[PDB]
Amino acid sequence: DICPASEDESGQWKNFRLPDFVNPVHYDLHVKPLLEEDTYTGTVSISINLSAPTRYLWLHLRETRITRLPELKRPSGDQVQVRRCFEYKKQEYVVVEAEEELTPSSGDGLYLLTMEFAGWLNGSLVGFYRTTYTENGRVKSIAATDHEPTDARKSFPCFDEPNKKATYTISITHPKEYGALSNMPVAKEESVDDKWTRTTFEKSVPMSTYLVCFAVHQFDSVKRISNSGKPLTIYVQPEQKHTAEYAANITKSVFDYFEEYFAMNYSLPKLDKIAIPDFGTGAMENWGLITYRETNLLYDPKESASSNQQRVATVVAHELVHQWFGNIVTMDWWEDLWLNEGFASFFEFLGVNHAETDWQMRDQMLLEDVLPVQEDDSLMSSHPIIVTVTTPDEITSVFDGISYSKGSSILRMLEDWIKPENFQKGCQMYLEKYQFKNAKTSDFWAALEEASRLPVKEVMDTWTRQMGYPVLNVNGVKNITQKRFLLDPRANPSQPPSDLGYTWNIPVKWTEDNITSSVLFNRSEKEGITLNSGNAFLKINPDHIGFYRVNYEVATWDSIATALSLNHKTFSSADRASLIDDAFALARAQLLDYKVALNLTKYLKREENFLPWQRVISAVTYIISMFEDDKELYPMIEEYFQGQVKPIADSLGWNDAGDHVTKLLRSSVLGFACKMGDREALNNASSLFEQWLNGTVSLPVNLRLLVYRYGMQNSGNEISWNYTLEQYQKTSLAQEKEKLLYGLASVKNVTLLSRYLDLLKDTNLIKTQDVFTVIRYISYNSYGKNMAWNWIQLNWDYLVNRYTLNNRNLGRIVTIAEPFNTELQLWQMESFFAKYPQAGAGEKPREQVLETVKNNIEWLKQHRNTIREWFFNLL
Ligand SMILES: *[C@@H]1O[C@H](CO)[C@@H](O[C@@H]2O[C@H](CO)[C@@H](O[C@@H]3O[C@H](CO)[C@@H](O)[C@H](O)[C@H]3NC(C)=O)[C@H](O)[C@H]2NC(C)=O)[C@H](O)[C@H]1NC(C)=O
Ligand SMILES: *[C@@H]1O[C@H](CO)[C@@H](O[C@@H]2O[C@H](CO)[C@@H](O[C@@H]3O[C@H](CO)[C@@H](O)[C@H](O)[C@H]3NC(C)=O)[C@H](O)[C@H]2NC(C)=O)[C@H](O)[C@H]1NC(C)=O
Ligand SMILES: *[C@@H]1O[C@H](CO)[C@@H](O[C@@H]2O[C@H](CO)[C@@H](O)[C@H](O)[C@H]2NC(C)=O)[C@H](O)[C@H]1NC(C)=O
Ligand SMILES: *[C@@H]1O[C@H](CO)[C@@H](O[C@@H]2O[C@H](CO)[C@@H](O)[C@H](O)[C@H]2NC(C)=O)[C@H](O)[C@H]1NC(C)=O
Ligand SMILES: *[C@@H]1O[C@H](CO)[C@@H](O[C@@H]2O[C@H](CO)[C@@H](O)[C@H](O)[C@H]2NC(C)=O)[C@H](O)[C@H]1NC(C)=O
Ligand SMILES: *[C@@H]1O[C@H](CO)[C@@H](O[C@@H]2O[C@H](CO)[C@@H](O)[C@H](O)[C@H]2NC(C)=O)[C@H](O)[C@H]1NC(C)=O
Ligand SMILES: CC(C)C[C@H](NC(=O)[C@@H](O)[C@H](N)Cc1ccccc1)C(=O)O
Ligand SMILES: *[C@@H]1O[C@H](CO)[C@@H](O)[C@H](O)[C@H]1NC(C)=O
Ligand SMILES: [Zn+2]
Structure with missing residues (x-):
């Protein structure tokens, strides 16, 4: 209708990937849900840093439609003539063509783009949606968002790529019976009718689109205060209030543990947690507003198992890790997703280890991540940690065992090799360096290479730019040789093609008679190495610390x-x-x-x-x-x-x-x-x-x-x-x-x-x-x-x-x-x-x-x- 679909390729919008020369700075976003109608409307105004001659401006949008012909502003402040709007379905874009091109934002002045959109709250668990629950016999409603990885664009039109970081000021017009939550605390509340309220939140720090979150709810709260003096609160249905207690304890303890370990302040004035009664993933690290599936947040000591307790503790730990790795420092592109998920999967075990001392968590890594993914990564149809993705379906697929578990496993090996104290400091420098920006895997190596002077890039690239892992074959008691380990003996070990040829630089640890020794096994030692007295038994890879198998x-x-x-x-x-x-x-x-x-x-x-x-x-x-x-x-x-x-x-x-x-x-x-x-x-x-x-x-x-x-x-x-x-x-x-x-x-x-x-x-x-x-x-x-x-x-x-x-x-x-x-x-x-x-x-x-x-x-x-x-x- 308005802004209709067209099969026109002749333009840069045919590119799957967004252009390099268009960059948002600030989002002014207003949404108004009609809860009982399962609909919403909104306007969004986006400040735009233009870098090149272009007659077209495009950004992501799916399912949600544009209702008013969009409105563009020159950096000086004037209104720009707009010929057409159109949807390009193939790459999920809405494009607007200006009458005749315009000029880069040379100074502090920026373009301003304003769009009116209408979307649905029903039939889905992504974007902006509504679900229900029952309280004292009454059907109640709650509305929330979930965006990772390419669903921000369903909620509202935006530059839906992790590196297109911008700052956010969100407002929501909702019925007064309801509260509204988002990433930042409330700034001001103003009555529209005697029925509706307009909740405006304070300006966010720069953050990626997938992290942007809001909710409309009638939930109670269980409260805690960090050592920083910031309010950490879990929102929860009144009937379920008692079951929020444990998550409150672990949030406090692990928040306090992490802020210290990472040597960096949590970037927001508050942090909220809430479980949506119907929620499509396990949990989502939306900055200051972590959303949960109930099973991963709500725990009853009188009814829940130790299994459940550890799950709640781990997911809370996990999502908290993201407030640094993922939120502050984000991956540049999804191919580097492990920078988020592997780090969270690794540090989660340290978080909960602090909180619960006799849980042997550090050991449990072997059961939860290391050994399971060694099964996964022995298949031909595995993929390297750094993954080429070219469609939204490909992007969502890589939230998997490799990104999480192998990510976690190779950090575990890396820490032990480089030693914890230096791994700690290296992560700290990476964090202060790339704060509110995006990193590539290359950057994390260089960060840690400045921390140990050891060959981190050379060694860790082998574990990261090709799938699979080695088996160490023991000859004599002491000679080892490396070879790719594949579950299928008929499979071709050189496929798929790898520059590194499926050989690794393996950090090797072994126990000789209660005493431990270390060696780095060079790729170029084509005919294996010998492990450095008077020996009858040699215990290779203690605690399965390295991401490899040993065949004695x-x-x-x-x-x-x-x-x-x-x-x-x-x-x-x-x-x-x-x-x-x-x-x-x-x-x-x-x-x-x-x-x-x-x-x-x-x-x-x-x-x-x-x-x-x-x-x-x-x-x-x-x-x-x-x-x-x-x-x-x-x-x-x-x-x-x-x-x-x-x-x-x-x-x-x-x-x-x-x-x-x-x-x-x-x-x-x-x-x-x-x-x-x-x-x-x-x-x-x-x-x-x-x-x-x-x-x-x-x-x-x-x-x-x-x-x-x-x-x-x-x-x-x-x-x-x-x-x-x-x-x-x-x-x-x-x-x-x-x-x-x-x-x-x-x-x-x-x-x-x-x-x-x-x-x-x-x-x-x-x-x-x-x-x-x-x-x-x-x-x-x-x-x-x-x-x-x-x-x-x-x-x-x-x-x-x-x-x-x-x-x-x-x-x-x-x-x-x-x-x-x-x-x-x-x-x-x-x-x-x-x-x-x-x-x-x-x-x-x-x-x-x-x-x-x-x-x-x-x-x-x-x-x-x-x-x-x-x-x-x-x-
Ligand atoms: C829950 O499982 C328990 C086992 O873990 C059952 O308890 C066991 O029942 C067996 C049979 O009644 C007993 O077997 C006896 O074992 C001793 C050796 O210690 C032998 O001398 C006996 O020959 C043998 N039975 C007989 C009939 O001679 C077990 O000792 C017993 N206890 C334990 C601690 O294992 C429970 O019965 C079961 N509960 C239910 C409700 O089914
Ligand atoms: C590693 O596994 C080996 C292979 O199974 C073990 O060697 C086997 O020990 C068995 C004894 O438990 C023997 O089984 C016997 O086989 C003969 C037929 O050849 C039967 O008549 C016997 O009844 C049967 N024993 C029983 C108790 O039923 C096997 O002879 C033998 N197999 C081979 C190939 O030598 C090793 O013991 C084991 N090593 C360990 C445990 O360290
Ligand atoms: C949410 O509900 C609306 C309204 O019922 C759905 O839109 C309908 O879609 C069917 C065909 O799929 C049509 O027959 C109706 O005429 C549509 N009605 C309107 C008003 O558009 C909508 O598809 C639902 N959303 C989701 C995500 O399932
Ligand atoms: C157990 O539950 C079922 C579902 O409530 C009972 O209901 C029957 O279910 C079938 C379909 O599965 C219907 O076609 C029948 O009409 C249902 N019976 C009714 C409504 O009376 C089932 O009867 C129950 N059985 C027991 C032993 O409690
Ligand atoms: C959350 O922390 C509190 C203490 O910070 C835990 O301890 C309870 O409180 C008292 C005194 O502080 C203890 O003596 C009791 O053993 C605890 N339980 C009760 C019911 O009072 C509390 O257990 C923690 N919450 C959990 C585990 O859900
Ligand atoms: C599986 O469950 C069905 C459902 O109860 C059983 O079928 C019932 O059998 C009993 C006794 O034969 C009858 O009273 C009911 O009328 C039957 N119910 C239905 C819905 O047909 C069935 O016997 C069970 N089968 C097995 C293998 O356990
Ligand atoms: C403890 C975690 C492994 C739980 C896990 N949650 C996460 O990983 C979140 O940080 C993810 N960022 C949420 C997510 C999962 C899958 C696809 C897209 C987005 C989940 O299962 O949802
Ligand atoms: C960082 O944290 C320290 C200690 O908790 C605090 O004194 C300081 O104000 C924080 N820095 C900010 C908010 O910029
Ligand atoms: Zn995660």
């Missing part, structure tokens, strides 16, 4: 198995987990015989630590998974591993006792017991479940999930399913809801799972934020593995229409096919993919799950007999 000689591996059987405590908890993790990965990759790997599990009846058990359970889950339908192998593996956990499972018992890590251990260990078919563990679950159904007995917090899952699995029926469904509706605590959803996915009943799948289309029952979680839970169920898979196929058009191909969670949902392991199942996947070839943000996940399923097929072919032999001979 078979003789050594054998000797490690025996040493574990005799006195496992000889190795640290981490070293055990790491040795077990490498061996099973090496076996998977056909680099070590499975008999050798399995032999390392023999000691387990005496295993008592969290870390080794976690990585054991991870490795076994996969093997068990591949033989699910093998009536010959399965009972044997079940029987074995049942026997290996039984003592620890019995020792810990079905009761909440012990410190944090013990409580976590009991969870995974009792769950594995149940998974492995321990009659007595299953009976504990059923018994507790039956009691829970009696309506009063509040289950031990760290056992609930297991009780709902295995209780429903073993004794669930329509009566208890219906009851569980009601309970899920009735409870206010999102953390409990999510457990109950997992419970409901556990029923061994096709009819009930079918009803459950149908509920996904009902927004009164399942929130939009939870659809993918539920699909994923159902896929874990022995019937539902195929039910969820079939349902996403039948309902693909429906999902795409509801979420759009740009939604990452929709892109990722095909990973429910990870357990598939037959040529039949692979053919199904490929057929579905060929029928719906427009994959959007699902393009990478598709590649990844396909590789995995192919690997599974090969794996079964290579290893069935060997694994069978090992189990048969033992039992």
